[PDB]
Symmetry: C3
């Protein structure tokens, strides 16, 4: 007399839990991770030029420490400073080291151009055993130590014009004697002085005499300062003692260059994202590996996981199992048997019982889901030279702000990630339920007065509906007028 046609949605045996706007742990038939939590441990030397510092820091490579001149005129996309690095040359100090380290790092080059300063009344090339270069004493390859010639130290007053169309970064210094005795014996005057200026900037450092800790055989020091000279501008160096003169300039640039402190072994491979932990794939939108990055990278978040639903809910409402073949619809059950689709049909008629998935709805759900997927991982976000976020020394005010800006950022992005994943998951679940409900309605209208909703997601079709008939319903060509009469009779009184 009649037939049965249930509408349904697939379900899987082993599903996944995800967060939403109302349920923290709600099961879906699938999910993709959004937080990269692991690194390979090795820094890929492609596609960014990785200049491993090894035993050198950027500053030592800059200054010309004897064990670092292998980096002379080096360039890099990312300079990697090793923790084992050490300095073996004249014990010096760089006031505002961080800034110098930062500005050179970003320049991405130690391209030094010797200029030819004529120092009359002293004659260059001082050297120390602390900076043993080769067989005997040496000094920073880029700095020029000037002492006394004969028995005097004429007031040095030289200039160097920047006729070039680029910024010149002059690195110079001043010597801090251990004793007034050392001061005099080297620079004659009781107390020397150094003043490096351009038309717009000036700096006059006074050598301070005193006994520091013994480092590499000395109690005296060298303070490092720098001076950038713009095009047209000129550089004047005046001094009456203690001048650790520059030998030229370092050509300055701007680019994607930066510097990273890491102990990760550099390796031959490709990876756009670099963290001190090693390279990390930037396929996912967020990462929990490190907040220090370089290259196209996933945003750092505090979360070690954020699963994005890429499927509908699993076996409706949820939990375990039961029932059997009487044919039930999409109400409180999904079909673990439908692997050939997401949504579909199951009929029980004259010819028996079977199932056929509806690719239309299956595709739409799948499509919309890939639509949000691409959107969620469509961005890249390249970040190169940024701020430091780990610090060796207590500094106070500037560090607190540097630490506060990042935490502030990290927290804002974690929330962004948490909310996005929830909104997206809520949407995906509604979107999938919607596709299902849509199919049921589409079939509901096709059947007209020839069938009744059995409340279980199935329609009781009040007329002989063999497989060919069941098919027509599935492929939208079901002509209801054809069976209207029989159904109207079977329905309204048997």
């Amino acid at each position: 007399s009649t037939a049965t046609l249930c509408l349904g949605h697939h379900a899987v045996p082993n599903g996944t839990l995800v967060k939403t706007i109302t349920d923290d742990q709600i099961e879906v038939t699938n999910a993709t991770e959004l937080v990269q939590s692991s690194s390979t441990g090795k820094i890929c030397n492609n596609p960014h030029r990785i200049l491993d510092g090894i035993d050198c820091t950027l500053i030592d490579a800059l200054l010309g420490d004897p064990h670092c001149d292998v980096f002379q005129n080096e360039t890099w996309d990312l300079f990697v400073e090793r923790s084992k690095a050490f300095s073996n040359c004249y014990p010096y100090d760089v006031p505002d080291y961080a800034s110098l380290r930062s500005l050179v790092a970003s320049s991405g080059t130690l391209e030094f151009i010797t200029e030819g300063f004529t120092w009359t009344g002293v004659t260059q090339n001082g050297g120390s055993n602390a900076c043993k270069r080769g067989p005997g004493s040496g000094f920073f390859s880029r700095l020029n130590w000037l002492t006394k010639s004969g028995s005097t130290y004429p007031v040095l007053n030289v200039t160097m014009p920047n006729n070039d169309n680029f910024d010149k970064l002059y690195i110079w210094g001043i010597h801090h004697p251990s004793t007034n005795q050392e001061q005099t014996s080297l620079y004659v005057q009781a107390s020397g002085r150094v003043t490096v200026s351009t038309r717009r900037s000036q700096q006059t450092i006074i050598p301070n005499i005193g006994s520091r800790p013994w480092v590499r055989g000395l109690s005296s020091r060298i303070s490092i300062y720098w001076t950038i000279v713009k095009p047209g501008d000129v550089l004047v160096i005046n001094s009456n003692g203690n001048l650790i003169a520059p030998r030229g300039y370092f050509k300055m640039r701007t680019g994607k260059s930066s510097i990273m402190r890491s102990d990760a072994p550099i390796d031959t491979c490709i990876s756009e994202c670099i963290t001190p932990n090693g390279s990390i794939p930037n396929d996912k939108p967020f990462q929990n590996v490190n907040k220090i990055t370089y290259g196209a990278c996933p945003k750092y978040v505090k979360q070690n996981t954020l699963k994005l639903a890429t499927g509908m809910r699993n076996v409706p409402e949820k939990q375990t199992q039961g029932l059997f073949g009487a044919i039930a619809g999409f109400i409180e059950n999904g079909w673990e048997g439908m692997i050939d689709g997401w949504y579909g049909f199951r009929h029980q008629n004259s010819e028996g019982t079977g199932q056929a998935a509806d690719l239309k709805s299956t595709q739409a759900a799948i499509d919309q889901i890939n639509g949000k997927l691409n959107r969620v991982i469509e961005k890249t976000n390249e970040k190169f030279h940024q701020i430091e976020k780990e610090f060796s020394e207590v500094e106070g005010r500037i560090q607190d702000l540097e630490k506060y800006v990042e935490d502030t950022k990290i927290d804002l992005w974690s929330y962004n990630a948490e909310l996005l994943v929830a909104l997206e998951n809520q949407h995906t679940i509604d979107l999938t339920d919607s596709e299902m409900n849509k199919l049921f309605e589409k079939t509901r209208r096709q059947l007209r007065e020839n069938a009744e909703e059995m409340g279980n997601g199935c329609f009781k079709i009040y007329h002989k509906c063999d497989n060919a008939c069941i098919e027509s319903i599935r492929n939208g060509t079901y002509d209801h007028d054809v069976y209207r009469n029989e159904a109207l009779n079977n329905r309204f009184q048997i």
Copy 2:
């Protein structure tokens, strides 16, 4: 025997594409831009007091450079520093220039109050040809150059009590001789010294001697320093040479004042938002003109566009055209013919065929949409003195942080904008579909057992329904019992 009544929604010929949670390019019947991408090129001198610096910087106007004293006692809401600006006076330098430039800018005033310092043992008014004021040599109108009287320079020790109920900003300085010869001939002592203090703060600067680049006929310089004196507090100035004494104080304030570097021509007009590019209308929530702003402004984002749907989807599912007059509902088609509403009806009956839009639903959709519109552009956000985001010089650490804070902000707001627009557009589309579906249901219940859903968004009304009848359905007064019998007969067997 019967009649037909379809439910529908309008559609337009030329529609717009917008982003959503699943589709990046989905067409709607309308959209409003959210990102202001263009500026007029001129800065409106209303409603903010625009003080054009012209050939002056704030610092030169402060100090009293001869070509800037036209700004004496000036006030402003926004000081606009021109790129052509130049200094024509004593070659000086302001350590922490930026801060002085910032703190004066925010004070918004150069209201100078001469105090009457008695300098015994020297006698004021030094002047230089580099600072040619009028016919002969001059000097910063606000600074007082003190040299030597007779043949000595008594240790200057004066004080100035802040009995006023406001902060006094004292701008003073120190002279840096080119040669010890110049030092002595001006201040007698081999080396002078300057110390400006209050009960809580102190600063002792030592004049450093040396040859700088020749600027305006000199190799010597003047360093500028400042001292703010709180109420009750007092200012003591001690020196034994090189003192470029202050002439009084600048009254300090707090307000909405700031300073902007721009080359935009100032123009007579009204506009709350100012960018270096020129004023921009702040009617939209975001802007892509510049991250440097002043006044009620749209938040800066990296996006040059963000369209906000202000209409439903266009001609259902989408693309091109076809079919004709057989009367179809809101299913896969919208009505380009319904310009008198958003939703409505179309019937085919005894008297012929026609259309009538339903203002109820039309208004609701329109209302909700304007509701979100107002919300989206209800805020103002006035921001006045902020941080600098463009820098002429390489500085390192502080610049990296200043650059990092803004990028961090800019990226967070771009995401905010991107997500908001998507959520809003997803909502608007659901909201509109909902209004439509609601109408169909309302009509569905009105018709009771007298009609059947033809699956195309139309109802086949199984009874004679002339236009007057069609009207009653449209205006909720359709009494179904009246035609129940005829419909029940026509339906359940003809």
Copy 3:
């Protein structure tokens, strides 16, 4: 012949207004506040160790001002600096005071360990009447004033090795004479000098002579500087005059410690969150009390209120009253009579009329709502030492950035709060309407061809349905085949 069964949802007399994606003021049956707007006015000394500074600042407690030595070796989780605090000891100044104040505050301890410096050629314990300790002159308990012995001041050159496995924070200083006369009479040399170094850092301060304002009977000052010495590292102090020597070191730590400027009375109570205004309950996600906080606290936002809907909409569409007992469903009216549930039924049949709420839907709505509630207030967010956000002095550049970072944050979180509340409220309203609509559908399917939707949210059940029958429908056991015939007859022609 028939019966009536309406589906409905409760409503309350006095409801609340909340924001959503389309309506700013839409009424719901309930809402929970999200913004903590009030503080008790007292700081709870539990669970954070509150060290009230009273008349002392951290720096004075550090240095050893006579009226502060009650804080010797103090520890704290939060040091509270009182506005009444004052200094009564040698008039000094701390260059970069803020940083010292910050780094000690975070250390959370003033655990001083005297080291035993041998000062040969001078002999310690200088004292002043400005720092009257007890009966006569005294000095900072942690600083050691060294003058001249006999008639000379030997070049002090001592060292102190950090053999300890922790950072040592040495606080030292230099004396600034009022007159060269005072300089000589105390330190012999025309001009002394101080240089404190470690193997990696150095600082050489030169005593600057001059007359400052008279403070506590003096015109001379003491500048404070500090030096942190790492493990293995060593500290060398060299000087030829003006050395205000340290007496040992302060053991350095890292932790949750911080410092807060407040005038709130400390009180015995428990509260994780501290604001200068006094403790505040951190049960709510956001707070509008102050942007300065310590402990697990609600995020600061500019909003003084953000209500989170914790109930469905009130009496449908909205406004006032009317109608009566004819029995209407959930369409444009809610039932103020249903206090025993959120959703439910009302029937009119043979036995009369009554109401019975449906706990199934009632529970689901309630559940989902508590689900989002917990999520909304599931986080804690502990923040300890952060940046300062209120400043006593004009500083410029660093303050602008510090001010800009916070405003930037505050604005981003206000938006986050505004959007979250709207999304959540939109969700809650849909979620509740959905539960209602779901119930109606569930009943719709149960009734099959035995009833018709009266369009008012009620079903006209075309068959004798006494209370026992009405019950079966309510508890899902309604067998429709039983009354199918009678209904089919009553329906399709009476």
